[PDB]
Amino acid sequence: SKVCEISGKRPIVANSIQRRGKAKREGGVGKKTTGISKRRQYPNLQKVRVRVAGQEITFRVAASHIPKVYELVERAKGLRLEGLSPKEIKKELLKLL
Amino acid sequence: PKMKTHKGAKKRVKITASGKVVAMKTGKRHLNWQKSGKEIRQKGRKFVLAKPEAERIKLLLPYE
Amino acid sequence: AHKKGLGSTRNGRDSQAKRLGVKRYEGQVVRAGNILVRQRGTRFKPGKNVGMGRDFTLFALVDGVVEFQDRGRLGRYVHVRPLA
Amino acid sequence: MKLSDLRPNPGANKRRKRVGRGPGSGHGKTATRGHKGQKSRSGGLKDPRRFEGGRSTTLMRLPKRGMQGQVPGEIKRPRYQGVNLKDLARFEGEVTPELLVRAGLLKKGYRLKILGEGEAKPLKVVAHAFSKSALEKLKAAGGEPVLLEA
Amino acid sequence: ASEVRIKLLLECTECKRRNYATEKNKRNTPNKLELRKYCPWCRKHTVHREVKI
RNA sequence: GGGGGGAACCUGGGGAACUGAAACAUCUCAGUACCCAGAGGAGAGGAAAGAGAAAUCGACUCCCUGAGUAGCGGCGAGCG
RNA sequence: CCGUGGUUCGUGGAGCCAUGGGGGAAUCUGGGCGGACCACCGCCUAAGGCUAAGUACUCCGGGUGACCGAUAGCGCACCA
RNA sequence: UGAAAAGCUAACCGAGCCCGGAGAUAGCUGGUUCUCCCCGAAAUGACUUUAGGGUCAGCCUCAGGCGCUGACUGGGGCCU
RNA sequence: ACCCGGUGAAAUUGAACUGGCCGUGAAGAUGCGGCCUACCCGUGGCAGGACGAAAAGACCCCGUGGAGCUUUACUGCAGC
RNA sequence: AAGGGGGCCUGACUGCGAGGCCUGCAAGCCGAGCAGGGGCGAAAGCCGGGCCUAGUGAACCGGUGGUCCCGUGUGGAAGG
Ligand SMILES: [Mg+2]
Ligand SMILES: [Mg+2]
Ligand SMILES: [Mg+2]
Ligand SMILES: [Mg+2]
Ligand SMILES: [Mg+2]
Ligand SMILES: [Mg+2]
Ligand SMILES: [Mg+2]
Ligand SMILES: [Mg+2]
Ligand SMILES: [Mg+2]
Ligand SMILES: [Mg+2]
Ligand SMILES: [Mg+2]
Ligand SMILES: [Mg+2]
Ligand SMILES: [Mg+2]
Ligand SMILES: [Mg+2]
Ligand SMILES: [Mg+2]
Ligand SMILES: [Mg+2]
Ligand SMILES: [Mg+2]
Ligand SMILES: [Mg+2]
Ligand SMILES: [Mg+2]
Ligand SMILES: [Mg+2]
Ligand SMILES: [Mg+2]
Ligand SMILES: [Mg+2]
Ligand SMILES: [Mg+2]
Ligand SMILES: [Mg+2]
Ligand SMILES: [Mg+2]
Ligand SMILES: [Mg+2]
Ligand SMILES: [Mg+2]
Ligand SMILES: [Mg+2]
Ligand SMILES: [Mg+2]
Ligand SMILES: [Mg+2]
Ligand SMILES: [Mg+2]
Ligand SMILES: [Mg+2]
Ligand SMILES: [Mg+2]
Ligand SMILES: [Mg+2]
Ligand SMILES: [Mg+2]
Ligand SMILES: [Mg+2]
Ligand SMILES: [Mg+2]
Ligand SMILES: [Mg+2]
Ligand SMILES: [Mg+2]
Ligand SMILES: [Mg+2]
Ligand SMILES: [Mg+2]
Ligand SMILES: [Mg+2]
Ligand SMILES: [Mg+2]
Ligand SMILES: [Mg+2]
Ligand SMILES: [Mg+2]
Ligand SMILES: [Mg+2]
Ligand SMILES: [Mg+2]
Ligand SMILES: [Mg+2]
Ligand SMILES: [Mg+2]
Ligand SMILES: [Mg+2]
Ligand SMILES: [Mg+2]
Ligand SMILES: [Mg+2]
Ligand SMILES: [Mg+2]
Ligand SMILES: [Mg+2]
Ligand SMILES: [Mg+2]
Ligand SMILES: [Mg+2]
Ligand SMILES: [Mg+2]
Ligand SMILES: [Mg+2]
Ligand SMILES: [Mg+2]
Ligand SMILES: [Mg+2]
Ligand SMILES: [Mg+2]
Ligand SMILES: [Mg+2]
Ligand SMILES: [Mg+2]
Ligand SMILES: [Mg+2]
Ligand SMILES: [Mg+2]
Ligand SMILES: [Mg+2]
Ligand SMILES: [Mg+2]
Ligand SMILES: [Mg+2]
Ligand SMILES: [Mg+2]
Ligand SMILES: [Mg+2]
Ligand SMILES: [Mg+2]
Ligand SMILES: [Mg+2]
Ligand SMILES: [Mg+2]
Ligand SMILES: [Mg+2]
Ligand SMILES: [Mg+2]
Ligand SMILES: [Mg+2]
Ligand SMILES: [Mg+2]
Ligand SMILES: [Mg+2]
Ligand SMILES: [Mg+2]
Ligand SMILES: [Mg+2]
Ligand SMILES: [Mg+2]
Ligand SMILES: [Mg+2]
Ligand SMILES: [Mg+2]
Ligand SMILES: [Mg+2]
Ligand SMILES: [Mg+2]
Ligand SMILES: [Mg+2]
Ligand SMILES: [Mg+2]
Ligand SMILES: [Mg+2]
Ligand SMILES: [Mg+2]
Ligand SMILES: [Mg+2]
Ligand SMILES: [Mg+2]
Ligand SMILES: [Mg+2]
Ligand SMILES: [Mg+2]
Ligand SMILES: [Mg+2]
Ligand SMILES: [Mg+2]
Ligand SMILES: [Mg+2]
Ligand SMILES: [Mg+2]
Ligand SMILES: [Mg+2]
Ligand SMILES: [Mg+2]
Ligand SMILES: [Mg+2]
Ligand SMILES: [Mg+2]
Ligand SMILES: [Mg+2]
Ligand SMILES: [Mg+2]
Ligand SMILES: [Mg+2]
Ligand SMILES: [Mg+2]
Ligand SMILES: [Mg+2]
Ligand SMILES: [Mg+2]
Ligand SMILES: [Mg+2]
Ligand SMILES: [Mg+2]
Ligand SMILES: [Mg+2]
Ligand SMILES: [Mg+2]
Ligand SMILES: [Mg+2]
Ligand SMILES: [Mg+2]
Ligand SMILES: [Mg+2]
Ligand SMILES: [Mg+2]
Ligand SMILES: [Mg+2]
Ligand SMILES: [Mg+2]
Ligand SMILES: [Mg+2]
Ligand SMILES: [Mg+2]
Ligand SMILES: [Mg+2]
Ligand SMILES: [Mg+2]
Ligand SMILES: [Mg+2]
Ligand SMILES: [Mg+2]
Ligand SMILES: [Mg+2]
Ligand SMILES: [Mg+2]
Ligand SMILES: [Mg+2]
Ligand SMILES: [Mg+2]
Ligand SMILES: [Mg+2]
Ligand SMILES: [Mg+2]
Ligand SMILES: [Mg+2]
Ligand SMILES: [Mg+2]
Ligand SMILES: [Mg+2]
Ligand SMILES: [Mg+2]
Ligand SMILES: [Mg+2]
Ligand SMILES: [Mg+2]
Ligand SMILES: [Mg+2]
Ligand SMILES: [Mg+2]
Ligand SMILES: [Mg+2]
Ligand SMILES: [Mg+2]
Ligand SMILES: [Mg+2]
Ligand SMILES: [Mg+2]
Ligand SMILES: [Mg+2]
Ligand SMILES: [Mg+2]
Ligand SMILES: [Mg+2]
Ligand SMILES: [Mg+2]
Ligand SMILES: [Mg+2]
Ligand SMILES: [Mg+2]
Ligand SMILES: [Mg+2]
Ligand SMILES: [Mg+2]
Ligand SMILES: [Mg+2]
Ligand SMILES: [Mg+2]
Ligand SMILES: [Mg+2]
Ligand SMILES: [Mg+2]
Ligand SMILES: [Mg+2]
Ligand SMILES: [Mg+2]
Ligand SMILES: [Mg+2]
Ligand SMILES: [Mg+2]
Ligand SMILES: [Mg+2]
Ligand SMILES: [Mg+2]
Ligand SMILES: [Mg+2]
Ligand SMILES: [Mg+2]
Ligand SMILES: [Mg+2]
Ligand SMILES: [Mg+2]
Ligand SMILES: [Mg+2]
Ligand SMILES: [Mg+2]
Ligand SMILES: [Mg+2]
Ligand SMILES: [Mg+2]
Ligand SMILES: [Mg+2]
Ligand SMILES: [Mg+2]
Ligand SMILES: [Mg+2]
Ligand SMILES: [Mg+2]
Ligand SMILES: [Mg+2]
Ligand SMILES: [Zn+2]
Known part of the structure; x- marks a missing residue:
């Protein structure tokens, strides 16, 4: 999953640390790492279709910012937009951001 | 580059005023139920390392 | 070719050497506390100014000079004459 | 005092040792290193202040x-x-x-x-x-x- | 030792410190161990009793 | 207005193993080599939601020192 | 809060800075921080941005070597 | 890729070639260059994933200190 | 193949003034001992020796070497 | 008497430890005597487990009971 169009969120490298044994916290000897390796964590990207200026616009955003998509529609209601291509519109909405 | 202190030695040993090297007596960490009082007591003290091993350890603590 | 059905050895061990024996002799000068005899049982018996430890070790109780003695059937003794 | 008059005291400046320059010098062939073994190799031994040939070291057997x-x-x-x-x-x-x-x-x-x-x-x-x-x-x-x- | 010859502490009844550690056979002498012993804390003697090691 | 190039230097995205640990997996090598994007004669950083014990200092960067200290660490090798 | 990175910090009593996931405020009587947590006493003002110098480098120009002198010195003194 | 031999993949493939990490690592083998003078070993013990490698001791050497203490021999006790 | 005219390599090579026997010696001697034998130099031939050439033995063992393969070896990753 | 029986008992002590055996280190071993508070004995005295020599495991990591020494601005607490 690439980049969230609203928040700019994107996947990062994160480790998978594998441990073993009882925690010292619980009077154990202590945790022992049996392995470290890299994985990725993706943004919860989701698809949010939406209709601006009667034309249907489709965003791809993290779930986290979905309500911000709907904020943008609310704000672009005060705007000349008609006869613009769907891309033309989306580019304009993101300009409000 | 400049030398590093051996933290293992630094945590186990001391350099006296005259450069003697002292440590705790070994052999008291556990299994003591049947160790005599005398033995647990005498191991409670410090002892001066033999010269050869002593002088090896002093090299390890150079900024001491 | 060569290395045929040989064998093994059901024994083949021993204990560490224990360094027993007389450690100071007749006429030797000694400090109180000096070990005089390491032994098993009383191969020697403690005499004048000589004590015996739990493992039969004979040591001097005074500074002095070590002296031996065979009293026949009464055994052998290590003494320590003190010095004036 | 002239520039020629200047010189150090005896002992103040020794000639460095140079091994591996032939039979007469006294440090030739092996170059004071003897024959073979880890110690003779370039790089040489593990830090001898600590290492003991793999046995538990005297230092590491003392208690913290x-x-x-x-x-x-x-x-x-x-x-x-x-x-x-x-x-x-x-x-x-x-x-x-x-x-x-x-x-x-x-x-x-x-x-x-x-x-x-x-x-x-x-x-x-x-x-x-x-x-x-x-x-x-x-x-x-x-x-x-x-x-x-x- | 063993499951049967066990290890144990002797606790001073006066001030609850454990000052000695020894053993016993559990099967042979199954009762707690009562014994007078010097207490360094109390600086007198004291009846000490067995306490789980 | 951009594109493409530039010896090294610079920031960012990704990122090894040999090796050391006298074996080895945590650890080390090392955020190194390398790949990619970008910046420019530099680049980065920069005007405190800072430091941290003094009723103190006052953006950042660079050098010396503090210091192989405080600490980190199969509390090992080592790192710092 | 969960999964991680950064720091001397390897899960450690583990804060602080960063954030992929979930829950999700307040506008100064508000918030963050001073190594779990709580009280006290203090420091600071997050979630917008810019900024010279001091620093790094050497394709290039010059100057200088108890630097080399054609098997040396750059791979190349020469039509490399 | 293989109608299967670990075959083939630019004249040697149980993991292509090039450049790079890179002077990987090598407790192994080999090599280590002028002269004269004085001394002069060891191939033993202990521990060692140690056994053709190491750490401590033993034996060599150099400097400073001590100064008859040395090997060997005579007399005399004691130990076996 | 051999001879004459023309052209003209190679592996190898410490240096060679390079005989036999019986002994000897690191136990398989042209090279040490004692004897024996042998005028100097070549050409065509044969392969018993020079432990002949070639390839730092592939067998064997050693190295706390490497690699490919296996699994109910350990730890991990993909995948589900 | 170190063997066999009985009486009373817990020295199968706490704080130390002159001096030695052994020995590469680290370990291991014997120990008179001093103080505390005890046991048995009329007393001298003996008692810091067992006639003696095997019956064992360094350090790291953690547990449990004490203590109340450190504890990150201060008092607690976490942790040592
Ligand atoms: Mg995308
Ligand atoms: Mg990332
Ligand atoms: Mg990252
Ligand atoms: Mg850990
Ligand atoms: Mg949707
Ligand atoms: Mg339409
Ligand atoms: Mg649409
Ligand atoms: Mg939502
Ligand atoms: Mg939410
Ligand atoms: Mg518009
Ligand atoms: Mg150093
Ligand atoms: Mg260290
Ligand atoms: Mg340490
Ligand atoms: Mg400290
Ligand atoms: Mg010392
Ligand atoms: Mg005990
Ligand atoms: Mg004590
Ligand atoms: Mg010394
Ligand atoms: Mg030093
Ligand atoms: Mg045979
Ligand atoms: Mg057989
Ligand atoms: Mg049989
Ligand atoms: Mg024996
Ligand atoms: Mg021994
Ligand atoms: Mg023997
Ligand atoms: Mg006695
Ligand atoms: Mg004895
Ligand atoms: Mg006599
Ligand atoms: Mg008589
Ligand atoms: Mg008799
Ligand atoms: Mg008698
Ligand atoms: Mg008798
Ligand atoms: Mg008799
Ligand atoms: Mg003059
Ligand atoms: Mg002059
Ligand atoms: Mg010089
Ligand atoms: Mg010389
Ligand atoms: Mg020589
Ligand atoms: Mg030579
Ligand atoms: Mg030398
Ligand atoms: Mg050689
Ligand atoms: Mg060599
Ligand atoms: Mg080396
Ligand atoms: Mg070296
Ligand atoms: Mg080295
Ligand atoms: Mg050791
Ligand atoms: Mg050590
Ligand atoms: Mg009472
Ligand atoms: Mg019971
Ligand atoms: Mg009582
Ligand atoms: Mg540009
Ligand atoms: Mg460009
Ligand atoms: Mg970035
Ligand atoms: Mg980078
Ligand atoms: Mg990028
Ligand atoms: Mg590695
Ligand atoms: Mg190393
Ligand atoms: Mg290694
Ligand atoms: Mg190694
Ligand atoms: Mg390295
Ligand atoms: Mg990075
Ligand atoms: Mg770094
Ligand atoms: Mg770099
Ligand atoms: Mg300028
Ligand atoms: Mg600048
Ligand atoms: Mg500038
Ligand atoms: Mg700048
Ligand atoms: Mg800036
Ligand atoms: Mg900025
Ligand atoms: Mg300010
Ligand atoms: Mg602070
Ligand atoms: Mg001040
Ligand atoms: Mg103050
Ligand atoms: Mg002031
Ligand atoms: Mg103030
Ligand atoms: Mg610190
Ligand atoms: Mg490290
Ligand atoms: Mg570190
Ligand atoms: Mg590092
Ligand atoms: Mg680290
Ligand atoms: Mg977190
Ligand atoms: Mg990060
Ligand atoms: Mg970290
Ligand atoms: Mg850093
Ligand atoms: Mg962390
Ligand atoms: Mg910790
Ligand atoms: Mg932390
Ligand atoms: Mg906090
Ligand atoms: Mg973060
Ligand atoms: Mg988050
Ligand atoms: Mg609020
Ligand atoms: Mg409001
Ligand atoms: Mg406020
Ligand atoms: Mg702060
Ligand atoms: Mg605090
Ligand atoms: Mg809080
Ligand atoms: Mg502050
Ligand atoms: Mg701001
Ligand atoms: Mg700037
Ligand atoms: Mg120039
Ligand atoms: Mg120039
Ligand atoms: Mg010249
Ligand atoms: Mg030339
Ligand atoms: Mg020339
Ligand atoms: Mg020429
Ligand atoms: Mg040439
Ligand atoms: Mg050039
Ligand atoms: Mg030219
Ligand atoms: Mg040219
Ligand atoms: Mg050129
Ligand atoms: Mg040219
Ligand atoms: Mg085919
Ligand atoms: Mg070809
Ligand atoms: Mg090719
Ligand atoms: Mg082949
Ligand atoms: Mg294949
Ligand atoms: Mg042994
Ligand atoms: Mg071996
Ligand atoms: Mg050996
Ligand atoms: Mg070896
Ligand atoms: Mg040595
Ligand atoms: Mg010898
Ligand atoms: Mg001298
Ligand atoms: Mg004199
Ligand atoms: Mg004399
Ligand atoms: Mg004599
Ligand atoms: Mg013919
Ligand atoms: Mg003819
Ligand atoms: Mg011809
Ligand atoms: Mg010749
Ligand atoms: Mg033959
Ligand atoms: Mg001949
Ligand atoms: Mg020959
Ligand atoms: Mg001859
Ligand atoms: Mg001959
Ligand atoms: Mg002819
Ligand atoms: Mg011819
Ligand atoms: Mg012929
Ligand atoms: Mg032939
Ligand atoms: Mg070969
Ligand atoms: Mg074969
Ligand atoms: Mg190897
Ligand atoms: Mg191995
Ligand atoms: Mg080995
Ligand atoms: Mg192999
Ligand atoms: Mg009796
Ligand atoms: Mg009887
Ligand atoms: Mg009887
Ligand atoms: Mg009896
Ligand atoms: Mg009975
Ligand atoms: Mg009785
Ligand atoms: Mg009575
Ligand atoms: Mg006991
Ligand atoms: Mg004295
Ligand atoms: Mg004294
Ligand atoms: Mg010793
Ligand atoms: Mg023992
Ligand atoms: Mg009494
Ligand atoms: Mg009586
Ligand atoms: Mg009485
Ligand atoms: Mg007793
Ligand atoms: Mg018994
Ligand atoms: Mg027994
Ligand atoms: Mg054992
Ligand atoms: Mg460890
Ligand atoms: Mg503990
Ligand atoms: Mg601990
Ligand atoms: Mg306190
Ligand atoms: Mg505190
Ligand atoms: Mg506090
Ligand atoms: Mg506190
Ligand atoms: Mg505690
Ligand atoms: Zn008590």
């Missing part, structure tokens, strides 16, 4: 002792440096820590504790702390011990 500290590190306490009366002879009148430091005695950033070694002159010594014996010894020779709290 006392507070070893822990993150977030050490705790800043007031540091005290001692000075004895014996090293207070080179003074007259007041004796402030400010003097004692400006004298090579009192190490900077240390508070001043007077210790009791040597004999006392009747003076006003101002310190952060006093030895039991020093306090009274100074009082006996009549001097004026003042305790700072700053």
